[PDB]
Structure formats: C-alpha cells, structure tokens
Design an enzyme around this catalytic site. Structure first.
Site, short mmCIF file in Angstrom:
data_model
loop_
_atom_site.label_atom_id
_atom_site.label_comp_id
_atom_site.label_asym_id
_atom_site.label_seq_id
_atom_site.Cartn_x
_atom_site.Cartn_y
_atom_site.Cartn_z
N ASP A 35 0.84 -1.21 0.00
CA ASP A 35 0.00 0.00 0.00
C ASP A 35 0.87 1.25 0.00
O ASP A 35 1.40 1.63 1.05
CB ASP A 35 -0.95 0.01 1.21
CG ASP A 35 -1.84 1.25 1.26
OD1 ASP A 35 -2.01 1.91 0.22
OD2 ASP A 35 -2.35 1.57 2.36
N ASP A 220 -1.52 5.73 -5.19
CA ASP A 220 -2.06 4.90 -4.10
C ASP A 220 -2.38 3.50 -4.62
O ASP A 220 -3.46 3.26 -5.18
CB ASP A 220 -3.31 5.57 -3.52
CG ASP A 220 -3.85 4.88 -2.27
OD1 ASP A 220 -3.30 3.85 -1.83
OD2 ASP A 220 -4.86 5.37 -1.73
#
Ligand SMILES: COCc1cc2cc(c1)C(=O)N[C@H]([C@H](O)CNCc1cccc(C(C)C)c1)C[C@H](C)CCCCCCCN2
Length: 377
Positions: A35, A220
């Site tokens: 992430d 992201d």
C-alpha cells in the site's frame, strides 16, 4: 539480483496486491498487502472470520512489546491494535532481515476481506502520515537504515487472478519498454504529485488546473479506482457519457454500483474514450502525459447470473479528499518510487493493456507554462 523479485506479487481483482513476508523467530509466514497510500506495517494478531492465519507474538522469541496502542482509519475500513517490534524478512525480496515496527491488529471494522488471502498491510509512504504520529518509523525507512538496500522501489501491477512485481531496491529493465518519465514528489507524506492538464479523447477539459489537485493528488496502490474531486469527476463523467451515448446504461452504473454486461466478446471498447493525465516534469516548463485505455477504467467483474457475458464496473468515482491514482491507473505502467531523488517514474509496462487500435502510453516532452500554479495551498 532483481530477477528473484520478479512476479513476487499476487492478488484478486479489486482486493489489492500482496507480497509474502515472515515475522518473528522462528519465522511466521503471512501475506501482506502492498500500500503506497499509507505508512503503517500491521498484521492480524487475533482470530477473525476472514483470516486464515495470524501473527502469534507469544511464539516469537524476538518479539518486543512497545506497550502503546494504535489505530488507523482509512477511507474504507479501520483497525486498532498493539505496537511492538520484531524481525521481518521478504523471502522473494532482498536477502536481509530488519527489526521493524509492527501493529498487532486485535480489532477491525470492514478492513479484512472475505477470502482475500492476505493477512496484513505494508504502508510504504512516509512517516508524516504514520499513526499514532510521525515518530513511528515506517518499515521501508527501517529497511534503508539497517541494510545497504538503496532508497527506492518499483511496482509493476498487472491487471486481470492477478499478479505483479515489487522490485525492492532498484529498477528491473526487463519490466518496461520505452523511456521512463519522472514527476516530482511534491512533499514527503503521501506520494503526492501535481497534475497539470487533463484530456479526454484529445480534448482539453479546460479547467483551472488547481481543480485537478484539490486538495491533493496521490499515487495509491491501496485503492482500486481512479478517484477525482467533485468538479473534475462531473466533467469527466459528462464527457465519457457523450462519447458512449451510442448505448445507454443505468445511472447507477456511473456511480459504481450497477455493473453492465455485453454478449461475450462483443464489448464496444471503441466508444469509450482515452484519458490523458499530464504530470509536472523535471525541467522548467516541461511536462509529460500518461494515457489510460477504457480497459483500465472498466474493471471486469464476475457475472452473478447464469449467462456468461462480459460484465464490468465503472472504476472512476468521486472524491472529497483529492485525486487518487489507484491500482486501475498503475496497471499497465512500471512505476518507480525514487525516494532518494524525490521523484516518481512512469513507463509502459511489459504487462500492458491491449486494445485493437489504441495503445496506453507515456509520452513527452510537452511544454506547459505556470505549472507551479497547479498546486493547491
Ligand atoms: C472508492 O474509494 C473507496 C476505497 C476503495 C479501496 C480502498 C480504499 C478505499 C482505501 O481506503 N484504501 C486504503 C489506502 O491506504 C487509502 N490511502 C489513502 C488514505 C486515505 C485516508 C487515510 C489515509 C491514512 C491512513 C494515511 C490514507 C488501504 C486499504 C484499507 C487496504 C485494504 C483494502 C484493499 C482492497 C480495496 C481497494 N479499494
């Protein structure tokens, strides 16, 4: 020695990409979601209906309790737990072992996904957005401090179940074609960049470029969709509607709820436009663009019916916290997080998306005046 890290990522569509890791002595094996949109390393450490396994601190002779709590609220999902440290390795990564901060998750809400096959999260962004505050050193900072691994990594996310590569410590040239184009990391918290122009099928949306970065733009890998500020989202949906008015869809399709289907093999790709995002470059008044095909923003979903058609969800949605360049944007590019030189690189991926008459691309240089004005303050 990067060939050992090629293809070290797996995942299910819409459920993130994960890498294999071990924590503790003796090593406990867990799958960890990668992430770039957060900065905490955390793992399941208590039973949960959706966890196949979890970290057992009691069984590790190297576990150290930090005797402090922690919670992280994401956009979707949240967890709380206990802070500690332990030894961590990446089997299909570099041959090193680091003592890292670990949040042992004891409670969670809408975080773990039923049947996902990952049990924790690896936040790769900077300390500034770490919880409970910026004194909790992120894993990648610990890796760079304790070993000779260079301060950069690269992500090749391959679309649809799914696979990819996280190259830790460098760039593997067999994973892309063409040239790398770099955009500055505006500030070291999120991986924040500046979008300076948007085109749909070659027509400028002609908005104040501040709208594109209101209130920020981030890269992201922990979010599926392309997410756009309200004003930009409405402009984009209006243009994509007009380009595809040949057919008609429920209005709940444009909200990401209802899926759309066509008879297998007959999806009308040619009526959905290409989207070009221009990013600030490395020299004065210079930018470059990346171009996204409809095969990227129409995410395929298994048909819940008996008919075997081709069914898709619209993977562009609205945001109130800025632009999110999610996994749907990253798929089909090789993305270099060059932390040492404060920049993010893009190139056409080796696992690129195939249209029949159109190609995803990274092209430059372009001239763009007053790029500094596009940043929001
Ligand atoms: C349409 O949108 C809804 C949406 C969809 C998705 C993710 C998120 C939100 C999501 O929330 N994904 C956050 C990222 O970290 C978010 N990164 C930015 C961010 C936002 C708020 C707060 C922070 C802090 C913690 C730094 C960071 C990480 C997730 C829990 C990872 C678990 C789920 C992965 C599969 C689901 C991907 N699909």
């Amino acid at each position: 020695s990067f060939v050992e890290m090629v293809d070290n990522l797996r995942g299910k569509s819409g459920q993130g990409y994960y890498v294999e890791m071990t924590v503790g002595s003796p090593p406990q094996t867990l799958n960890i979601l990668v992430d770039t949109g957060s900065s905490n390393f955390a793992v399941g450490a208590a039973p949960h209906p959706f966890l196949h396994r979890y970290y057992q601190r009691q069984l590790s002779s190297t576990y150290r309790d930090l005797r402090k709590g922690v919670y992280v609220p994401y956009t979707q999902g949240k967890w709380e737990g206990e802070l500690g440290t332990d030894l961590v390795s990446i089997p299909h990564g570099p041959n090193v072992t680091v003592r890292a901060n670990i949040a042992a998750i004891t409670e969670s809400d809408k975080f773990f996904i039923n049947g996902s096959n990952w049990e924790g999260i690896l936040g790769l962004a900077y300390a500034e957005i770490a919880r409970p505050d910026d004194s909790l050193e992120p894993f990648f900072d610990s890796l760079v401090k304790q070993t000779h691994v260079p301060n950069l990594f690269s992500l090749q996310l391959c679309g649809a179940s799914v696979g990819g590569s996280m190259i830790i410590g460098g760039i593997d040239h067999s994973l892309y074609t063409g040239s790398l184009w770099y955009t500055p990391i505006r500030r070291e918290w999120y991986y924040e960049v500046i979008i300076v122009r948007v085109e749909i099928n070659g027509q400028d949306l002609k908005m104040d470029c501040k709208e594109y970065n209101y209130d920020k733009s981030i890269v992201d890998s922990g979010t599926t969709n392309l997410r756009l500020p309200k004003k930009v989202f409405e402009a984009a949906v209006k243009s994509i509607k007009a380009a595809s008015s040949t057919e008609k869809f429920p209005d709940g399709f444009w909200l990401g709820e209802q899926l759309v289907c066509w008879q297998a093999g007959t999806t009308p790709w040619n009526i959905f436009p290409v989207i070009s995002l221009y990013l600030m470059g490395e020299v004065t008044n210079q930018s470059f663009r990346i171009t996204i095909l409809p095969q990227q923003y129409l995410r395929p979903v298994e048909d819940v019916a008996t008919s075997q058609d081709d069914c898709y969800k619209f993977a562009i949605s609205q945001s109130s916290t800025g632009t999110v360049m999610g996994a749907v944007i990253m798929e089909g590019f090789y993305v270099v997080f060059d932390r040492a030189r404060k920049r993010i690189g893009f190139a056409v991926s080796a696992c690129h998306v195939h249209d029949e008459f159109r190609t995803a691309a990274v092209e430059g240089p372009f001239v763009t005046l007053d790029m500094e004005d596009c940043g929001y303050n």
